[PDB]
Design a protein around this ligand. Sequence first.
Ligand SMILES: NC(=O)c1ccc[n+]([C@@H]2O[C@H](COP(=O)([O-])OP(=O)(O)OC[C@H]3O[C@@H](n4cnc5c(N)ncnc54)[C@H](O)[C@@H]3O)[C@@H](O)[C@H]2O)c1
Ligand SMILES: NC(=O)c1ccc[n+]([C@@H]2O[C@H](COP(=O)([O-])OP(=O)(O)OC[C@H]3O[C@@H](n4cnc5c(N)ncnc54)[C@H](O)[C@@H]3O)[C@@H](O)[C@H]2O)c1
Ligand SMILES: NC(=O)c1ccc[n+]([C@@H]2O[C@H](COP(=O)([O-])OP(=O)(O)OC[C@H]3O[C@@H](n4cnc5c(N)ncnc54)[C@H](O)[C@@H]3O)[C@@H](O)[C@H]2O)c1
Ligand SMILES: NC(=O)c1ccc[n+]([C@@H]2O[C@H](COP(=O)([O-])OP(=O)(O)OC[C@H]3O[C@@H](n4cnc5c(N)ncnc54)[C@H](O)[C@@H]3O)[C@@H](O)[C@H]2O)c1
Lengths: 423, 431, 431, 428
Amino acid sequence: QPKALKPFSTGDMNILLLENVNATAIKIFKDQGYQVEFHKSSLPEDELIEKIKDVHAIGIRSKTRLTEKILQHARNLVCIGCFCIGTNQVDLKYAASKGIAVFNSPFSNSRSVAELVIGEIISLARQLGDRSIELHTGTWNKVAARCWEVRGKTLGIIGYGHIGSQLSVLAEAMGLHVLYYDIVTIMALGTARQVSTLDELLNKSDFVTLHVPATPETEKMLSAPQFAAMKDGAYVINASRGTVVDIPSLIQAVKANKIAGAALDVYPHEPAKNGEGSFNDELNSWTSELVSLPNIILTPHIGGSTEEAQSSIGIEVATALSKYINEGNSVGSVNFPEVSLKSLDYDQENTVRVLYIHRNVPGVLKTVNDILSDHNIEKQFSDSHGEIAYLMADISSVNQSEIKDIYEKLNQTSAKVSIRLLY
Amino acid sequence: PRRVSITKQPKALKPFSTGDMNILLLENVNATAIKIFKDQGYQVEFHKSSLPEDELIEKIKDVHAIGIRSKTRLTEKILQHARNLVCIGCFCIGTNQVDLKYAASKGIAVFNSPFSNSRSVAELVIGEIISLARQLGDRSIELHTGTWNKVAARCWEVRGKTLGIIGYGHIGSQLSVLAEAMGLHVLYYDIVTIMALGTARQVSTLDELLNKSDFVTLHVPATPETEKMLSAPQFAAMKDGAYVINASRGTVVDIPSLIQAVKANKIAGAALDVYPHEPAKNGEGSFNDELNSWTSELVSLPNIILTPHIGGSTEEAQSSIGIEVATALSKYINEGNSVGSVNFPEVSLKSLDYDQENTVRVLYIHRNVPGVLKTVNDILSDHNIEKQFSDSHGEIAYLMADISSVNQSEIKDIYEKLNQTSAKVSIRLLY
Amino acid sequence: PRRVSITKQPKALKPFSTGDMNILLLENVNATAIKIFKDQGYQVEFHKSSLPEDELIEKIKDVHAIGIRSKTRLTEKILQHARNLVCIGCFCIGTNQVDLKYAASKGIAVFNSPFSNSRSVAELVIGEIISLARQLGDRSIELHTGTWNKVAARCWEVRGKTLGIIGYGHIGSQLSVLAEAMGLHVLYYDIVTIMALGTARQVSTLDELLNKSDFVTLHVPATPETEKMLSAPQFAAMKDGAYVINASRGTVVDIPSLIQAVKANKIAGAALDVYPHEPAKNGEGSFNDELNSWTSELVSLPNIILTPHIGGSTEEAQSSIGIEVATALSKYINEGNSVGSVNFPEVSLKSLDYDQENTVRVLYIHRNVPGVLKTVNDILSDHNIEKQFSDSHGEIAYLMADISSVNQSEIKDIYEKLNQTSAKVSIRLLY
Amino acid sequence: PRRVKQPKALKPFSTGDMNILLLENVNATAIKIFKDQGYQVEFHKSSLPEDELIEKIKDVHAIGIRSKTRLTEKILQHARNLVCIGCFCIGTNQVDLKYAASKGIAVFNSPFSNSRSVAELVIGEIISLARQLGDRSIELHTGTWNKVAARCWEVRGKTLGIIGYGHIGSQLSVLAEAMGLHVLYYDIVTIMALGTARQVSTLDELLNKSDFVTLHVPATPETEKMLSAPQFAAMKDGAYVINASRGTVVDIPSLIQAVKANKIAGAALDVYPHEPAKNGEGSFNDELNSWTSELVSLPNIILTPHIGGSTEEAQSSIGIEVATALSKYINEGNSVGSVNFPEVSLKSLDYDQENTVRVLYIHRNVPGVLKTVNDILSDHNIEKQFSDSHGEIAYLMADISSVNQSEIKDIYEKLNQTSAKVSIRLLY
Ligand SMILES: NC(=O)c1ccc[n+]([C@@H]2O[C@H](COP(=O)([O-])OP(=O)(O)OC[C@H]3O[C@@H](n4cnc5c(N)ncnc54)[C@H](O)[C@@H]3O)[C@@H](O)[C@H]2O)c1
Ligand SMILES: NC(=O)c1ccc[n+]([C@@H]2O[C@H](COP(=O)([O-])OP(=O)(O)OC[C@H]3O[C@@H](n4cnc5c(N)ncnc54)[C@H](O)[C@@H]3O)[C@@H](O)[C@H]2O)c1
Ligand SMILES: NC(=O)c1ccc[n+]([C@@H]2O[C@H](COP(=O)([O-])OP(=O)(O)OC[C@H]3O[C@@H](n4cnc5c(N)ncnc54)[C@H](O)[C@@H]3O)[C@@H](O)[C@H]2O)c1
Ligand SMILES: NC(=O)c1ccc[n+]([C@@H]2O[C@H](COP(=O)([O-])OP(=O)(O)OC[C@H]3O[C@@H](n4cnc5c(N)ncnc54)[C@H](O)[C@@H]3O)[C@@H](O)[C@H]2O)c1
């Protein structure tokens, strides 16, 4: 059985959710007794600074920029939830220096990207995109030439991680052979086979799919030589990062009848907001040329744009913020020492949890364990991350009177960054 | 279990009183058929399109087997001139383009490929389940015209959703296995009880399927009972925001009712491969209100996938069609095998051992009237009948017999005696 | 997938000029056979043992079908007295106890159950693979005599080991899927190329299987090439501490060599179900040096499992035999269907629709000489032959014909004429 | 899926050579793992007499035992240098765990390493009982040829009743279905079924509908003799009972009656209420268990000397599991998975983290101890620290950053002089 913990003082917890986090997060926060403010869009800096001064936790996504300019006004902010993969929109170092833990959902889009690729393998192999554009404009063009059953073909997976490995099992289920290249040796799932070099994957694959991070080594890793290494009439699918494919080379290989089709979800330059005129030659010089090619599927970075994906994002990040607020748990934080302890058995009464964010300088634990020396330390865990560190301690026989004293002593320590007490 | 049969070599048979076999293939049959036909020693004439009635009438008088597809119409008008035509291959599903009854009355067996498109249609629906669930068609049309529209609202991971398969036959049962592999629950309705594949579950009524499914797929034949079988009432029984896929027959969905359910936000997306009226040839401007009154309206709707009846348009499907029907025609010509014919008694016999020399196979198509076997087994009475099989299909019947100890002299005599019988429709001897 | 076959119900047929059918079942065939026969309206006489030659000759004179197993000897001596015997069922694999040639010359079709024991032998081997791997036989023998001997040395988890299957037939292929399911690697040697089940791999030579296998199991027929195919040379090619299982034939393993390889600690354990010489009846002292010289030495060895040829000794196996052979005889009695007969031309026709009234099925077993079908189709010439099939097997042949519009009066004439023909061996009409 | 800076291997501060004592014939994988660290290993195939053990344990740093060796306060009181105890088996009752803990000795075991071996064992015995193979082979070894098909079964189509759907049971489930069994399972908690197995609400439903009943439950007061007459009467005529769990779960007298009354057709027993401590003849008799000679007289009963986990693979996995655990506790502070000890560990240190020392502080769970320790360490940066308590003892692991050779000896003596100290080790 578990022991629910409360925060000494503070009053009700205030959550600010921006950019339309999924309702699963809203339900979780409300079920904690938190007060939730929800917005479907981001906020202008003025409205955001005003709303953030008294907020305890903020949930954002890709567009909201939490810089020092806005975080300096965050008086009560305990943690930040990024309900997405990227954390670049948050000044992680500054947030850490003020004891604000930041969380994300890194792998919540794996299934959605994998299902996307399965659909696009089939669409490219059958030219569904072109056929449907044709009928929507009156053209009847029944084509069986060079249209393929996906059964029996070979899928080349570049990057056999979270997405690649799930795509592997789906591809075999559809009857594909799976070859994968990766810069590390990975145990294959099902009947997939890893190949030593990229060129072997390119030579032997009918479908080439990219699921790699953005690194200097992945920058334009598929260009003219790599397209030349592929099979005549093979297919390229890129739902990874916009830098991984050299688009001019792809346009050339397609225009030269070397590549039979392509599906692009990511681009070197992408619009900051949705709009009618946003995808054009000013954004990417080759756009008007890319748009003129047959059997290219273009998607506005929708690799993770599903209800389920956002629902999983909601649960992971809301649960994470909930465990950090209610317990202290920082595991999985992107800028913060990863610290946690087993929850309390409910019957362990008069037990208090000390959450002490401080500077990573000698003597701090000396000070803190002195302050706590009149009580039995049941459990203690302290870890450091750069110039900050984080201490969790469970103390045994503490009554209401001595919580104020233990708290006020810790709040007066020289190395303190942030202190919370949990009942 | 599958093993290389290490028994006695078969005795390849050659037709009596004939020259080289002439095959006419129309409408761009796949190369797998041409290879099989040439490997039989046949003489193959190949055309990418059909033939006009005049040019076809002259060409068919000396043809032994004709290969067609959907467009070539082999009516009594043109078949009257087929003096040497042994069999007709339809390298497609439909046989309506052939006068099957007349072809039978002249002893011409017809073969088709009914189920060669199963895999291609099944994968088609999988891609379309995903495309509709993710709105791929709309997103991609948007980018080709400059519009950037990242949307996650009511775009779905397909895992955990329910596929409603209406018609659990060759395509449906194969779609079932693919669907579960993609993580869907599969429900199927059919007018017959069928053993489910994997963990699919058959439902008693159509409405139960419609109420419980997220994706509804049609894989039914064209019958009076399937005519517009999904219409306004059935869309009302479906889930809010459900998806309709029809890659079966163009009459099975009432399109005006579908358009209405889409405009009323009841149906979230639809994928149509077949239509009440379809063009006869590819071309621009072919798909419009003159073909189907509601086209301009259907085209204006969001998240609708429209395909020009490409459910079986794959290299593999056409390759299997080529192999299936060419093998069928070849075995009927070279052996006598009529199993799988659409207009003809289904008759065959085990091949003869290489060492069964001087054995001849009689292929005797005749009228289904008493006394014929009396005549035939009389004519054959000086030889031992090794095997014999005769079966009837309406007014015609077909006799295969293997008779032993036959020399060249006795082949001409047996042939003309059988060729002189009153009940004869067509006679071939295989030596 | 399996479907509710929607066709017209069949027209159950009853023999002309005969009364109730008399079935004689000997040697304790399973009750599933008795049930099927009684449900046909047949009269069933059942015995737990065979019959002495005197009682058998008298009882067989008026019996229509006889069911036997291994011990009943149906020779010419006793079959010459069988006036009404239409068919013989062997509810086992072996048919040597039946004079197949003589029975055929008198028009008596024989059926058996060749493969009904496949599942039982496969499960037997799985259980023995584990028992040999864990020395279960010994451990349990040990405690039954007071000895406590917990041993992990050289006892193995079966997961990860390699099973060598010699003979990848009915039993072997079923053993393959069970073995992989138990986590085994499967290699198989066979004199034929066979497509492997699951992820099994066929090896080119027997020695490759022997070198690479942890468990070697034999599932081969008895042939000159299989006699003693595992002896000292083959044991020398196996792995140190490998295992031999023989549930095939008593000739395939050289037991003195196996005893030699075990005593040299080369073979770690063995499971034997079959032996060069086996007792005729169950009893103590029956398995000894007089039966096989090496018995007393074989029993002295550790971790050898010995079973009294119980490979097919399950309720299910005997039940499947009951279903198989009783169904086979029933279809041959009720419909003429001789497919699967071991001594007889294999002949059958699609059954007739309930409504096809006045349709008669002619069953004509005869001598394989020219002119017979001339005669028969003469006799039937006043009626339309709907279907006819005749095949030959050595000196006999078998004619099935369905003839249309036949009344009670003209059935007796057709029968008496056919009964008078010179080539007749046996004639039955089904009405 | 599984995928391919190196850690800074730590050495105990100024100590001697490591001494490992391995008893009861532990698998060679444990010996190999220990020697690869340079440890000194003494190996024995059997246990040791109490006299020889007391002398040998005085100077040993780590001991590996199994079920028979009893490490009581009598023998552990002489353990001067004993840091940890490895139980290369499941049971730990043969060790006085509290006494070991009060002296700062962590104890480790291998709880689930035998799952596969017991599961395959039951498969073999399901088949052996379904065919009464044991009897047939005993018969031929004494000359009797008795070909029987009556009441012998193909296992396909039958129902396996798994009682206790835990590590072994769940693994048995998939194997049973692969063999063609229908699987029903009873357990006091709702558990997600593997494959197509189905949980039954009550034990009686499992007994009524199963052909083969197998027990995979812990030894608790609720399982004590849980299958007795009332249960056997609820089973099908000619059903089979397999017990490879604990010797108390089956009421053997009721089973003998059910076999004698032809109600139960066969049984396979691997565990027993009383079992010998060592292998030998005559050890399994009426003096050990009153009903032994009568149980042995029954047809189609498989008896095995507790060999459910007696496979090379299982013992190799036990060897790897426990030796790794003991090695990580010695070479690092890692006590996760110990049966008597606070579970404490920290991420290992990067090769490049020079002059870093790891403090391992066993102590009494009383207030003020951490006050003392972080004072002693206050001149150095605490990179990481973790302390947890377990009853009367507690265990502190700490990484300190800038420490030279001079400053280690002082840190050691200070911690070694503390009032609450039970055991202190420093890793350099
Ligand atoms: N389109 C979308 O909406 C969307 C959604 C989620 C993720 N993504 C992106 O897709 C990519 C894959 O995500 P994931 O979670 O599967 O990643 P991951 O970190 O789990 O796996 C990436 C794999 O790529 C391999 N790799 C790295 N560099 C490589 C190189 N140069 N060549 C070959 N292999 C290399 C790594 O070893 C690893 O196995 C990431 O870049 C992620 O940001 C896109
Ligand atoms: N789009 C294409 O290019 C393409 C290609 C091949 C086939 N098809 C068409 O798809 C359909 C399915 O082909 P198939 O080979 O799977 O057919 P099939 O004959 O194997 O199976 C059809 C199933 O529908 C069931 N059924 C019949 N009437 C029904 C009714 N009223 N309600 C419900 N179920 C009913 C039948 O019992 C059967 O199981 C056919 O009409 C075929 O022409 C289309
Ligand atoms: N022990 C029993 O009670 C019992 C029960 C049933 C069957 N059997 C016996 O088991 C054997 C197997 O039965 P089955 O139905 O599986 O047979 P099967 O006919 O299905 O298969 C036998 C296989 O052995 C192969 N083979 C033949 N000669 C070979 C050789 N020299 N080397 C390697 N492979 C060779 C064949 O190619 C074939 O694949 C038979 O002898 C049968 O009598 C025993
Ligand atoms: N024979 C051997 O050599 C050997 C080897 C290993 C384990 N075992 C024994 O086998 C048993 C199973 O081991 P495991 O590792 O799978 O155990 P486990 O702890 O993983 O699972 C036991 C299961 O039994 C259930 N259970 C407990 N009490 C129950 C009751 N009264 N009724 C029904 N279900 C009940 C529990 O819920 C649990 O699901 C243990 O007792 C273990 O000691 C014996």
